[PDB]
Amino acid sequence: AVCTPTAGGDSSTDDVPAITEALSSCGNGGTIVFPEGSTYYLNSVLDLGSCSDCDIQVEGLLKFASDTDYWSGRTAMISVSNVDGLKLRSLTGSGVIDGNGQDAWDLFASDSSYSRPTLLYITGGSNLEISGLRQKNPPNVFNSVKGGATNVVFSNLKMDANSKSDNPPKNTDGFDIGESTYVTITEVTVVNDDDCVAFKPSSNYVTVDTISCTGSHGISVGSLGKSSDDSVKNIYVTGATMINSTKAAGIKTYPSGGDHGTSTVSNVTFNDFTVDNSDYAFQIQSCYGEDDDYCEENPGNAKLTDIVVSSFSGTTSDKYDPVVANLDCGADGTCGISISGFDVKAPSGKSEVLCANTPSDLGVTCTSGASG
Numbered sequence: 338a339v340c341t342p343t344a345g346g347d348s349s350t351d352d353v354p355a356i357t358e359a360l361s362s363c364g365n366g367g368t369i370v371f372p373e374g375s376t377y378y379l380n381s382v383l384d385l386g387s388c389s390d391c392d393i394q395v396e397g398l399l400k401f402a403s404d405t406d407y408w409s410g411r412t413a414m415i416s417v418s419n420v421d422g423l424k425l426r427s428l429t430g431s432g433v434i435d436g437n438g439q440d441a442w443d444l445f446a447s448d449s450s451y452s453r454p455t456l457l458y459i460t461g462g463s464n465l466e467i468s469g470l471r472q473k474n475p476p477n478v479f480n481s482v483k484g485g486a487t488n489v490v491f492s493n494l495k496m497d498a499n500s501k502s503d504n505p506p507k508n509t510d511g512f513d514i515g516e517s518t519y520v521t522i523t524e525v526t527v528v529n530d531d532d533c534v535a536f537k538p539s540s541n542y543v544t545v546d547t548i549s550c551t552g553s554h555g556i557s558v559g560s561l562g563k564s565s566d567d568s569v570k571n572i573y574v575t576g577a578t579m580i581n582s583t584k585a586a587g588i589k590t591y592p593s594g595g596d597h598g599t600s601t602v603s604n605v606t607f608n609d610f611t612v613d614n615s616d617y618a619f620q621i622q623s624c625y626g627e628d629d630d631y632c633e634e635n636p637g638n639a640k641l642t643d644i645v646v647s648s649f650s651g652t653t654s655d656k657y658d659p660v661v662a663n664l665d666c667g668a669d670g671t672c673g674i675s676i677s678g679f680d681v682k683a684p685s686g687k688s689e690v691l692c693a694n695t696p697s698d699l700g701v702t703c704t705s706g707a708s709g
């Protein structure tokens with residue numbers, strides 16, 4: 338059956354109950370429709386848990402309340418917990434989920450203790466498809482996948498976070514992919530101020546194919562090792578256009594000492610990247626979250642194996658010219674990275690790669706003085 342949630346038509350009226358009742362009524366194998374030209378006001382967490390092989394067609398605007406007191410410390414704006422079989426999609430392409438994040442960014446700018454929710458938070462479950470829609474101005478992370486979710490596909494998404502003030506949209510990661518298997522991200526555009534895609538602990542079998550990121554911190558493994566032994570494996574990223582990003586791609590691990598654990602990264606390929614005014618084409622950080630003196634006494638021991646960086650082109654920014662990559666592998670770790678078709682230059686035309694603890698078969702000429 339097909340259900341259309343009743344739109345209250347006013348931002349002071351929360352539409353969430355109407356939406357979850359529609360999902361409860363039709364979500365066992367049915368369809369829920371937000372019609373083209375509609376606006377729904379979501380003034381609380383939208384929990385999609387009653388979905389079981391359901392199809393949620395978003396053709397209108399779902400506008401979340403900014404209500405910073407309400408959202409304070411909350412996990413998710415849209416919560417997708419242990420759902421098996423979901424399609425959350427715009428079939429017209431007109432659907433927009435607006436996180437209304439401005440107030441959160443401004444509050445966080447003045448008070449770093451302010452804790453913000455993730456816009457689309459998937460944990461556990463299986464066979465989830467998210468497609469065709471725009472995500473606008475999330476308070477914090479756009480999309481997260483964890484809890485052992487399997488078979489999750491994000492396709493044809495337009496994601497943008499733009500501040501109307503001088504305070505940037507901090508920590509607006511496009512995709513934080515944690516404990517999961519068989520996640521695919523394809524044909525997505527991201528404009529944000531943090532990681533485009535971050536591979537978090539226990540991510541496995543992730544494919545990212547054709548992505549554009551502007552203003553991001555790159556396609557980034559980690560951070561790993563903060564307080565446990567963390568692994569990322571079997572990752573394939575191809576066709577990334579990285580514009581004005583701090584790095585196009587990289588790996589970040591904590592050093593040893595304290596409560597830090599060991600990081601394992603195996604079989605990760607970054608292929609066919611276009612670098613357009615990004616600060617580094619590639620970066621390895623092995624002293625993440627600590628300083629140089631700390632890392633001298635507490636060396637990094639990350640185990641990186643079968644890391645492939647292939648077919649990178651373009652031009653970095655002025656910032657680190659002549660350096661186009663900073664490969665600071667840990668002193669006690671394995672730095673199993675191979676680079677080929679690396680055609681990236683700084684604006685000057687130079688192409689220096691800083692290295693520490695890199696292997697003899699790296700594939701590009703190294704210069705000493707890597708750090709981070």
Ligand SMILES: *[C@@H]1O[C@H](CO)[C@@H](O[C@@H]2O[C@H](CO)[C@@H](O)[C@H](O)[C@H]2NC(C)=O)[C@H](O)[C@H]1NC(C)=O
Nearest residue numbers: 519541542543544570571572573603604605606
């Ligand atoms: C290295 O990682 C890649 C990327 O995940 C693996 O290739 C995937 O394997 C899974 C499971 O068989 C398939 O569902 C996908 O189709 C594959 N993805 C791609 C992009 O090819 C690959 O098997 C891993 N290699 C090793 C030796 O472990």
Ligand SMILES: *[C@@H]1O[C@H](CO)[C@@H](O)[C@H](O)[C@H]1NC(C)=O
Nearest residue numbers: 528551552580581582613614
């Ligand atoms: C990237 O940065 C340059 C230099 O600041 C700027 O002129 C350009 O508009 C930015 N590009 C995008 C797509 O925002």
Ligand SMILES: *[C@H]1O[C@H](CO)[C@@H](O)[C@H](O)[C@@H]1O
Nearest residue numbers: 339340341342370371372
């Ligand atoms: C609820 O109403 C909308 C708009 O009329 C339909 O598109 C949908 O199928 C359901 O009947």
